[PDB]
Design a protein around this nucleic acid. Sequence first.
DNA 1: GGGGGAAGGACCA
DNA 2: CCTGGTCCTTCCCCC
Length: 440
Amino acid sequence: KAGMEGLDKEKINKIIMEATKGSRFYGNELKKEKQVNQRIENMMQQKAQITSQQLRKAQLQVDRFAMELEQSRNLSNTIVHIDMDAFYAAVEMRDNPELKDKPIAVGSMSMLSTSNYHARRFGVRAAMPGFIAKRLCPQLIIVPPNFDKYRAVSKEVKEILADYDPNFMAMSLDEAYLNITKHLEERQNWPEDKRRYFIKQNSVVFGTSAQEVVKEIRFRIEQKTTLTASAGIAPNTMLAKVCSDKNKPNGQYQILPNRQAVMDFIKDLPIRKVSGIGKVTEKMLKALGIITCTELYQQRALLSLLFSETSWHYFLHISLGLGSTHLTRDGERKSMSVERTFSEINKAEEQYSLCQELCSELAQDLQKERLKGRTVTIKLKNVNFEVKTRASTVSSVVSTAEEIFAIAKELLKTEIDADFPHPLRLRLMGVRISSFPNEE
DNA sequence: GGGGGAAGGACCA
DNA sequence: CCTGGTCCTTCCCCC
Ligand SMILES: Nc1ncnc2c1ncn2[C@H]1C[C@H](O)[C@@H](COP(=O)(O)OP(=O)(O)OP(=O)(O)O)O1
Ligand SMILES: [Mg+2]
């Protein structure tokens, strides 16, 4: 929940319910929850078994760990995270003035991808189904999305970000972390004319602090596109995205560099607000009485010893308010994917056709990167939202519609047999290549 | 006990 | 009446 707080959780939750109480959807959730509740046992059972001297041991390992992490804590880097405001919604607003002063969302009667801050006041939020959305906000306008138009604006803004961290990394069409560390240096000595801007004595000049560059950045981005950004300044990434959001929309927040500011901040930060901690992790941790970063730190004894090697590691890094100061080389596609939702299809002949066209879709997108891949998964969601998923891998490499349909076909084939003499009643079918070629 | 491969999930925009 | 990606953790089965 990030955008508009101060909401009538009462009326809004009743309404969200009515349109769910008996919905096929609700069912799968309602019993996906049983799985969450019973996983908690596994953990609480594995706690009861934990002994005193065990924890005593578990400690020193961890404490040590905390130590050098703390000795290696880096604060010379100034990391910024730019996050756009109601991004798709904000573009659409811009492009079609008729929508200026109206609650909108970008999406579909089945699901909203985002919504303007206006609509947000009614309770409409991203990941919400439109049909529910319009029960909270009768006058909500649902624009269909047009990604080629959003890519348009992402590119546009990046032409700015270039000028500051020409090696920034961008998380999405709407987010990028930057590192002004370098820029701020040169920027100490710019004259004011290197920093004066015209505002569409009507003209302004930005000073020389990090707080002042992110001011300037957000300015230029607003002046170019009419869209606003919130931005979060800190000395690593984790802290940055959390800051970006502490003054949305149109605003910015700085944790200055030193152990305290970070601690000052970290102390009562509800664990949920960190990237990568979600509905579930929260419910688990919260089940151990962990709610705030601090509570997380001081539970570290138990967590290292109850969770996976990589998880408690992560947990701990947050405990101390540690992230990453180096922005990484572009990356590499690990997969490509295409899936689609539809009214029930329980006639096999159709299921196969749908697949063919999905594979056809995929292969084309694939061609556009001139990439070839040697594994393949179908996804297939029952009309109860229960979801199976089947993989396969060739030895050579696959690349086009037909050839990669030859695998999809047989992957499905078995799953029809498997449930035969029943048809697969379906809502969602999907298909994705994986694998890759590198140098050699 | 590794590691490559399939089945599932968590969490992210 | 609920919409492309990554990166894990469990089994598996090869060695
Ligand atoms: N669940 C989703 N499905 C499809 N598209 C999404 C989804 N969530 C987010 N997006 C797209 C639309 C969002 O505008 C965009 C950026 O995400 P995010 O920054 O979380 O929201 P936002 O920029 O629209 O609002 P905010 O002002 O809170 O940032 O990514
Ligand atoms: Mg989070």
